[PDB]
Amino acid sequence: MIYSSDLNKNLASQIIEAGTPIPGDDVVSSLKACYQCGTCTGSCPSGRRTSYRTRKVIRKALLGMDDVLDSDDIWKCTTCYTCYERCPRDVKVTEIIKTIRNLAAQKGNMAKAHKMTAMYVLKYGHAVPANKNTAELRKSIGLSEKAPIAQFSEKDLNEMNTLIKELGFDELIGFDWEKGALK
Residues that bind a copy of itself in the complex, under the rule CB under 8 A: 1, 48-49
**Interaction between residue 80 and ligand SF4 (CB under 6 A):** yes
Q: Where are the alpha helices (DSSP H) in 64-151?
A: 67-70, 82-86, 93-106, 112-123, 132-141
**Which one, of 80, 72, 121, 122, lies nearest residue 101 by Cα?**
72
What are the φ and ψ backbone dihedral angles of 33, each rounded to 5 degrees? -90, 0
In the chain, what is the straight-line distance between the N-terminal and C-terminal CA atoms, in Å?
37
Cβ 7 to a copy of itself shortest distance, Å: 17
> Smallest distance, Å, CB 157 to ligand SF4?
32
Instruction: State yes or no: residue 30 binds ligand SF4 (CB under 6 A).
Output: no
Nearer to ligand SF4, 37 or 121 (CB): 37
Report in angstroms how near the CB of residue 124 gets to a copy of itself at its nearest: 41
Calpha distance 15→98 (Å, rounded): 10
Q: Which amino acid is at 61?
A: A
Binding segment (CB under 6 A) for ligand SF4, from list 14-22, 72-80, 98-106, 157-165: 72-80
Q: What residue 1 binds from ligand SF4, a copy of itself, none (CB within 5 to 8 A, per partner kind)?
A: a copy of itself
